[PDB]
Amino acid sequence: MSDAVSSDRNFPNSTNLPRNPSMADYEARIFTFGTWIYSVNKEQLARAGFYALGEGDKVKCFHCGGGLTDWKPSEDPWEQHAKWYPGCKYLLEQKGQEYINNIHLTHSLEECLVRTT
Numbered sequence: 001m002s003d004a005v006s007s008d009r010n011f012p013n014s015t016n017l018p019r020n021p022s023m024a025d026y027e028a029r030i031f032t033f034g035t036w037i038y039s040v041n042k043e044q045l046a047r048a049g050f051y052a053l054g055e056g057d058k059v060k061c062f063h064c065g066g067g068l069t070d071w072k073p074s075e076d077p078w079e080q081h082a083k084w085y086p087g088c089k090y091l092l093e094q095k096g097q098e099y100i101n102n103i104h105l106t107h108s109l110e111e112c113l114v115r116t117t
């Protein structure tokens with residue numbers, strides 16, 4: 001439970017000292033991936049604050065302080081990340097909440113299979 005789930009942060013400090021653009025640079029990110037993961041990752045991640053941790057094609061945010069490994073279809077890091085959590089510093093700094101809001105939510109469905117649409 002830690003120092004009171006309510007008097008702590010519902011977790012052992014998720015943000016592991018993020019906001020480290022010094023090493024999260026452009027060539028720093030791509031460099032991590034050692035040109036192995038999918039294509040279009042250069043601008044994709046470099047712009048969304050995603051860098052390679054060491055898994056096979058997986059990714060995580062180094063500027064926001066959160067992970068987003070591959071466990072679903074191709075799903076561009078842009079869409080996948082925004083759904084993972086809108087409270088990601090850099091992530092928002094790029095396409096603002098207007099985008100993340102459009103992503104996380106949906107185009108109109110938001111019914112899950114159909115429900116009542």
Ligand SMILES: [Zn+2]
Binds near residue numbers: 049064065066089091
């Ligand atoms: Zn993030």
